[PDB]
Design a protein around this ligand. Structure first.
Ligand SMILES: Nc1c([N+](=O)[O-])ncn1[C@@H]1O[C@H](COP(=O)(O)O)[C@@H](O)[C@H]1O
Ligand SMILES: Nc1c([N+](=O)[O-])ncn1[C@@H]1O[C@H](COP(=O)(O)O)[C@@H](O)[C@H]1O
Ligand SMILES: Nc1c([N+](=O)[O-])ncn1[C@@H]1O[C@H](COP(=O)(O)O)[C@@H](O)[C@H]1O
Ligand SMILES: Nc1c([N+](=O)[O-])ncn1[C@@H]1O[C@H](COP(=O)(O)O)[C@@H](O)[C@H]1O
Ligand SMILES: Nc1c([N+](=O)[O-])ncn1[C@@H]1O[C@H](COP(=O)(O)O)[C@@H](O)[C@H]1O
Ligand SMILES: Nc1c([N+](=O)[O-])ncn1[C@@H]1O[C@H](COP(=O)(O)O)[C@@H](O)[C@H]1O
Ligand SMILES: Nc1c([N+](=O)[O-])ncn1[C@@H]1O[C@H](COP(=O)(O)O)[C@@H](O)[C@H]1O
Ligand SMILES: Nc1c([N+](=O)[O-])ncn1[C@@H]1O[C@H](COP(=O)(O)O)[C@@H](O)[C@H]1O
Lengths: 163, 163, 163, 163, 163, 163, 163, 163
């Protein structure tokens, strides 16, 4: 069963959040994907967050741009850990998204990743690290994936064009 | 009856939001004041915003600091106009509050005022201007209040210490 | 009659402010549109703001970029509520516009929306919400428009390409 | 046994990180606390991160200020999930700390919380939420703690001085 | 006669603008000082700027804080050169003041000085440099003042406590 | 004779500073144009600033990007008034240029205009306003130019496409 | 032998760091180039920095983008002077890179250059200046290179198109 | 003889730059200290930088606040390596100082350290690292100083109050 949900405020956010989904495809981690807006579908948000525990989610990754309320509002309504991905916004280049996600007051946390597609990939990796604490197989695939990333850099030390 | 509600994410916000209440005392505008947190009391927020129309509110002023979700979440759940006051936060000096309130995406507006006590006073004045469109008496008191503010500056053109 | 005016500092601002006009076309709200510059036509600004009440305006939406003086100067000269739209500027990406509109001192408010076309659309929606407090028909169309926006997201929960 | 470590770049950071420790005292979660500097004790950092899995840690909370390398360098060396707390710095008010923690590139995540003591408390709460996925007792205490926080706001709706 | 006017949006700005007045006292340059608010006394602003030429002003120094409209609105209404002093604001530390003064669009300039009391002193010095182009005596006093400032640094090269 | 010099740190700055030159062509104001770098030609800078008075300059406009030292270093070496134009830089979008020009300490002023081509045009207009205080003909052309700009906006109040 | 190493967090950084290499080609300074990631190859970083002294390096230039840990982590592990080049990042335009490199706490320095390709070129020039203190030939080539840069500006004072 | 000079734009900067001097006292490195202002003593700056090589300096540390021109102007006039310390300014908290020092264009480098007293200490340490490349004794004292700093953290792993 899917132990992680990837949600996002808008279809346009998929350009960014697809990179979280890609990590899970690589690591063979079942996941659910859904557009849930704090602003445009507030009642669905509430029912989504209320049922997350009972639906079997152990991590929720939420992405949004601009005044990014989605991740914090999910976190207000569930004990399932929430990771937040700030989507790059046009004018403020995701600074608004970042401040509106990370600056949660005491009592209702959201673990925040980097602005944009690097943070989407990292949210899925952090979610996978969380899951891997109690899933030996996934822990192994993660270790393999990390080693592969390190080996790629190690076997290519010179960035210049071939001799 | 009270046609405006002043709400805020925390009791600590009252140091700032009191300045909105002061404007209404001056203009004799009945108002309701309440601590409503998007993060700490999400279900109350929803019921507050859902009932605002039926409770007779025509403007809601919402103040919050940090990742300020309160004003936008109220606006998502009611057609009653929402004005947002960014409370000055410790580290980011209300920049986080300002970006998290003003940068609402298309579809769910929050009219935002200045960071801190000047924005609290201005939110109440803008709310009073909105009400005064259909309240001749209040329009008159506003006009009187404005004239008094202008006259104060006009009768004191020299800022230096007396001769 | 038109109960809202949309004004802007320059013709170039129309690329942004057109999105406010679009909302009003959708909601069938009569509106006036005009280029009024605080800097290039200061005397027209003064006469525009002075006559707004007598011309029947109940909300003014003002857009400008850079050192954005237009919305605040209108507000200084009329009791008609002013909503400000920060236009995205080249170098500072509308941060200058946002600070120059939102940071009004105590006494002369401007309700500020998001930088750029999302704030233009939201200003018109907030203006329509203000008008809808005393216009049952408009209140209904707004409710319909909101429901349509929510339904669009609800009927499209999966952002991925079709099976 | 302690399933969470709280580490920080300097003794001076304890003024902030104590607030993470406080959450764990409240929730009765055993924890380890240590000063580990990426810059001043790089070899200890490496051995700390290398042994974290074998020492039984399931979450690491790392706090640092300025050019905050500690959390990301821990994360580079272990699969144990890392939460980062940006400590408020003098000149840049923790903006440097926040950017240096949150903006990790793809491959090595750090879940980041708010600048300063609110983020320290939230990191411990997020760590506790992570642990509570497989610890029914802790899940219960968390639920109790949340309810207590909500009830406090609910039973005190009026922020004004007593009648 | 006074060839320079020092104006400011509020009496509170005098704490800053006094430093412009001090330069003129030192250089024996007659000057006029007045509180003129774009926001609170818009009609006085217009009449002030309209009459400046006829009143004999050759430079106007305008100081304001927050959404600082005063200098740009003066400049819109007169050909007399306007220098703008951004007053340090509470939350944004004069960044708002600076952006709202300096970012004037093409056609209506305001020469902007540093945030706060250093910019007030510099505005008066720049105004004096402008006047000194056609006033040999003032040019001489300026030269004397500059030499005195240079000599002070030159005769005190070691910043350490006396032997 | 030329009473204004337009100088700039690099040939690449001409893309921006050309807009100052354009104003002077329009107003028929003789001007000198030169590349002078504080960093790459420090001795020329010194001799340029030292001789400016004797060469007949009454205003100097200096443009530079990045760590923009040119305007302030000219001002340190001459009593001729200096206006500074921050050129838009790649990474920081002229914010670096703006802070490095405007934030001069007490004693050595530089009147600063907007980032980029609007500030270049405005520097020339402010320089022309300075010159026009003692040049009736130029004062007249300026007045004509301003009226033309105002008339353009006035005769085009509707920004929408023709009926 | 090579007395300078140019290292960078990723192959993608070569687009920027190539400009450091170009300076060394011009000045005929032997150099080593390598991709070394603090995050993706932490153990290689440690062995690289540990052996730098013994490998004959007298300056290390390190470039990285985003949460840029590379330069500071090298500096933590060697006494060889480290110069840091902030690579321009997508969302934050190298501001993150700059803060994460320059804001090192007391005890472990990194001399930081400008964001992007200008800082890469300058790091190599500063490294060459450091080496030239004890290398008369290199000192001479540097002097020649500087003179050539100054002469280029001097022989091209007019930036306008040929007569 | 003194192989390093510590210079600063003003006596007030000594509060910060004293921390560079302290490092040199600890490491027994002879040094020269002087107030040299780019703005207030431009001719002294030029003669200082011109003679630095002949006076035996191998590193110059320059501190300044605000529009910080000193370090870059020294670097324009000498091949002796220049390290820049941004002094914390009142309004902009040393951000202006940092941008005006670090953002040097290609050709004239300044190695920049952290804002404020930590950067002053680090500039002296980086200068000492540069000198230590050819001074075995100083290299040894540096190594000793580093080890002492590491040992301090290592022997104090628990930041909490004694049992
Ligand atoms: N922040 C947010 C929420 N929310 O926080 O609930 N819902 C949509 N949004 C944001 O609106 C931004 C623009 O959405 P759209 O107008 O392109 O549909 C998206 O980045 C989306 O995440
Ligand atoms: N933003 C917010 C919300 N909310 O947006 O729903 N609830 C509380 N807060 C903010 O937490 C900040 C600190 O609250 P407290 O920890 O002092 O109770 C306050 O400014 C409050 O507005
Ligand atoms: N801010 C402003 C005012 N005003 O505040 O009165 N008038 C024009 N402007 C701004 O100049 C900016 C550029 O105008 P333009 O040079 O393209 O005509 C526009 O965004 C316009 O809103
Ligand atoms: N960032 C950092 C690291 N590190 O990232 O490894 N070690 C110490 N620091 C920071 O130096 C800052 C000042 O430390 P100190 O000079 O007061 O000991 C602290 O906030 C500490 O976290
Ligand atoms: N900006 C401005 C204008 N104006 O631009 O016309 N009038 C007052 N202000 C500003 O309100 C700020 C606070 O004023 P006050 O509320 O202390 O009277 C002052 O810095 C003043 O300059
Ligand atoms: N700031 C500056 C100085 N100076 O302040 O003396 N000289 C060149 N510069 C700047 O280098 C920037 C890039 O110059 P270049 O590398 O394209 O020649 C230009 O914007 C120029 O103004
Ligand atoms: N900062 C950093 C480190 N490090 O600090 O050790 N390693 C890679 N990076 C950065 O990841 C950024 C993107 O890398 P990549 O995802 O394109 O490979 C690069 O700018 C690189 O310098
Ligand atoms: N930046 C600068 C220069 N300069 O760059 O040549 N000279 C003085 N300053 C700065 O003026 C600031 C205030 O100086 P003062 O008005 O307190 O004497 C100081 O930080 C000093 O470094």
């Amino acid at each position: 069963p899917a132990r992680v949900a990837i949600v996002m405020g808008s279809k346009s956010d998929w350009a960014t959040m697809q990179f979280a989904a890609e990590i899970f495809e690589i690591l063979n981690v079942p996941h659910h994907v859904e557009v849930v807006s704090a602003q445009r579908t507030p009642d669905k948000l509430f029912s989504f967050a209320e049922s997350a525990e009972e639906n079997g989610y152990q991590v929720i990754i939420a992405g949004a741009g601009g005044a990014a309320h989605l991740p914090g509002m999910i976190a207000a309504k569930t004990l399932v850990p929430v990771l937040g991905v700030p989507v790059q916004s046009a004018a403020l280049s995701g600074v608004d998204s970042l401040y509106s996600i990370v600056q949660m007051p005491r009592g209702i946390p959201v673990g925040t990743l980097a602005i944009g597609k690097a943070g989407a990939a990292n949210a899925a990796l952090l979610a996978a690290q969380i899951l891997a604490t109690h899933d030996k197989e996934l822990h192994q695939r993660l270790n393999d994936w990390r080693k592969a990333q390190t080996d790629e850099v190690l076997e290519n030390p010179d960035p210049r064009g071939a001799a």
